[PDB]
């Protein structure tokens, strides 16, 4: 077991390229071990959940090569049909984005698969896709509406019009993917914009497809075509030092190359409200997908009313925003994001936790939070095997007082693996040592 200890920084300094978006590489090998033809990808995240991707595709005959030096895939496409049916369950490890997309794919397969991962991952809820998928014709058996899944494939779907209940993009994906297997016209309806990674990369991947009203639309059984792909930096990544440097006086920081998707900005468009001093320049559009470089300098926060819109927006940053609220002059207050609670851990427990257990009052709602600004101790918090927990309470080590010990940090590598080499190369402070 390996801990997080952290002391104090002196401001942040220097220019980081953060490696690649998790999300959009899930969505790029999956597409592209199906695709006809030889897909190049750049950028792909070399963490422990895009690589279990990566394993479960190869368990079902992907042709997949890895050069996780250079963070370069070399996809062979197989085409729609050409996957085999797995001898053993797939492992997703802690990956949600796995699983759902996974059974997707799966659910129009003419085999069986069974889907499983780590006790994080099996707590994680799936009736959300059970349900939607059961409706175009999938069997899938669960106890609890929990992984694991076991997948009774159909290759005889029918297509559906359906309305997603919460902003899920795992649940608008996963549908989507059983929709180029299902007879006829699978259409999404989403009240709320939600990540639309899978859009552009069947757009990319010459799919035709089409928005309508909020709806968006594909048609079962056309062909996915070989394209190469270049995956911008993680914003999600690019996020805790976009905080830290806000937040530590003395810092001035470039971030290059992250991806500016406005269905990721959520971070950004908060902080800026709050009084951030964040710079968006040199606009790039490799793939259908916005890069930018980021520039961020120190500037005094101020709490806000989060307004609900920016809740799907911003989904993942929560924890690292929430350092934010802690050390701003005044209240913030978080609704509208129980979703919060569902994640790797339950977010919203864990962020109380470790704030209070640091001297700020802040207090939980079913939905949400309210954040007293304050002053960030120093002292110890526990990550509950979650990445972004821990990361976030690395970054609040960067004002704290004095040292911060972060508990159980082997989860950090399942969407960052560089975190700590880059967080001392800007001048965080950051330190791997044994745990218990
Ligand atoms: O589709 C994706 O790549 C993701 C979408 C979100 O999940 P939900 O669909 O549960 O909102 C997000 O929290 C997750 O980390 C990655
Ligand atoms: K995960």
Same mark, same amino acid.
């Given at each position: 077991?390996?801990?997080?200890?952290?002391?104090?920084?002196?401001? $942040?300094?220097?220019?980081?390229?953060?490696?690649?978006?998790?999300?959009?590489?899930?969505?790029?090998?999956?597409?592209?071990?199906?695709? %006809?033809?030889?897909?190049?990808?750049?950028?792909?995240?070399?963490?422990?959940?895009?690589?279990?991707?990566?394993?479960? *595709?190869?368990?079902?005959?992907?042709?997949?090569?890895?050069?996780?030096?250079?963070?370069?895939?070399?996809?062979?496409?197989?085409?729609?049909?050409?996957?085999?049916?797995?001898?053993?369950?797939?492992?997703?490890?802690? @990956? +949600?984005?796995?699983?759902?997309?996974?059974?997707?794919? $799966?659910? +129009?397969?003419?085999?069986?698969?069974? $889907?499983? !991962?780590?006790? @994080?991952?099996?707590?994680?809820?799936?009736?959300?896709?059970?349900?939607? *998928?059961?409706?175009?014709?999938?069997?899938?058996?669960?106890? =609890?509406?929990?992984?694991?899944?076991?997948?009774?494939?159909?290759?005889? *779907?029918? =297509?559906? &019009?359906?309305?997603? #209940?919460?902003?899920?993009?795992?649940?608008?994906?996963?549908?989507?993917?059983?929709?180029?297997?299902?007879? !006829? /016209?699978?259409?999404?309806?989403?009240?709320?914009?939600?990540?639309?990674?899978? %859009?552009?990369?069947?757009?990319?991947?010459?799919?035709?497809?089409? /928005?309508?009203?909020?709806?968006?639309?594909?048609?079962?059984?056309?062909?996915?075509?070989?394209?190469?792909?270049?995956?911008?930096?993680?914003?999600? @990544?690019?996020?805790?030092?976009?905080?830290?440097?806000?937040?530590?006086?003395?810092?001035?920081?470039?971030?290059?190359?992250?991806?500016?998707?406005?269905?990721?900005?959520?971070?950004?468009? $908060?902080?800026?409200?709050?009084?951030?001093?964040?710079?968006?320049? &040199?606009?790039?559009? /490799?793939?259908?997908?916005?890069?930018?470089?980021?520039?961020?300098? &120190?500037?005094?926060?101020?709490?806000?009313?989060?307004?609900?819109?920016?809740? #799907?927006?911003?989904?993942?940053?929560?924890?690292?925003?929430?350092?934010?609220?802690?050390?701003?002059?005044?209240?913030?207050?978080?609704?509208?994001?129980?979703?919060?609670?569902?994640?790797?851990?339950?977010?919203?427990?864990?962020?109380?936790?470790?704030?209070?257990?640091?001297?700020?009052?802040?207090?939980?709602?079913?939905?949400?939070?309210?954040?007293? !600004?304050?002053?960030?101790?120093?002292?110890?918090?526990?990550?509950?095997?979650?990445?972004?927990?821990?990361?976030?309470?690395?970054?609040?080590?960067?004002?704290?007082? !004095?040292?911060?010990?972060?508990?159980?940090?082997?989860?950090?590598?399942?969407?960052?693996?560089?975190?700590?080499?880059?967080?001392?190369?800007?001048?965080?402070?950051?330190?791997?040592?044994?745990?218990?």
């Amino acid at each position: 077991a390996m801990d997080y200890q952290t002391i104090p920084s002196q401001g $942040l300094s220097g220019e980081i390229c953060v490696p690649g978006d998790k999300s959009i590489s899930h969505r790029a090998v999956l597409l592209a071990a199906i695709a %006809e033809g030889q897909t190049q990808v750049d950028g792909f995240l070399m963490g422990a959940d895009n690589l279990a991707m990566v394993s479960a *595709l190869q368990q079902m005959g992907a042709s997949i090569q890895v050069i996780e030096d250079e963070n370069i895939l070399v996809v062979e496409g197989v085409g729609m049909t050409g996957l085999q049916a797995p001898p053993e369950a797939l492992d997703c490890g802690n @990956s +949600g984005t796995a699983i759902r997309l996974l059974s997707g794919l $799966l659910a +129009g397969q003419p085999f069986n698969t069974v $889907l499983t !991962g780590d006790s @994080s991952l099996q707590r994680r809820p799936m009736k959300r896709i059970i349900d939607p *998928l059961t409706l175009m014709g999938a069997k899938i058996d669960s106890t =609890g509406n929990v992984p694991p899944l076991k997948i009774y494939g159909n290759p005889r *779907l029918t =297509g559906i &019009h359906y309305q997603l #209940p919460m902003a899920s993009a795992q649940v608008k994906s996963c549908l989507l993917l059983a929709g180029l297997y299902a007879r !006829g /016209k699978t259409c999404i309806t989403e009240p709320a914009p939600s990540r639309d990674h899978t %859009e552009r990369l069947l757009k990319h991947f010459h799919y035709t497809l089409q /928005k309508d009203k909020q709806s968006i639309c594909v048609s079962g059984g056309g062909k996915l075509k070989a394209n190469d792909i270049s995956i911008p930096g993680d914003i999600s @990544s690019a996020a805790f030092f976009i905080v830290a440097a806000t937040i530590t006086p003395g810092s001035a920081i470039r971030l290059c190359r992250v991806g500016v998707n406005p269905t990721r900005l959520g971070v950004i468009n $908060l902080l800026k409200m709050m009084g951030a001093d964040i710079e968006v320049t &040199h606009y790039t559009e /490799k793939n259908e997908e916005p890069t930018a470089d980021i520039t961020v300098r &120190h500037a005094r926060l101020k709490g806000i009313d989060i307004p609900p819109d920016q809740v #799907p927006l911003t989904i993942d940053e929560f924890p690292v925003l929430l350092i934010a609220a802690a050390v701003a002059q005044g209240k913030t207050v978080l609704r509208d994001a129980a979703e919060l609670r569902v994640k790797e851990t339950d977010r919203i427990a864990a962020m109380v936790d470790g704030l209070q257990k640091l001297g700020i009052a802040a207090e939980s709602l079913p939905d949400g939070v309210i954040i007293q !600004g304050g002053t960030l101790e120093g002292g110890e918090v526990n990550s509950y095997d979650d990445h972004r927990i821990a990361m976030a309470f690395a970054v609040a080590g960067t004002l704290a007082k !004095g040292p911060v010990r972060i508990r159980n940090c082997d989860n950090v590598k399942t969407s960052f693996p560089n975190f700590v080499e880059l967080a001392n190369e800007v001048g965080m402070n950051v330190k791997g040592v044994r745990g218990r």
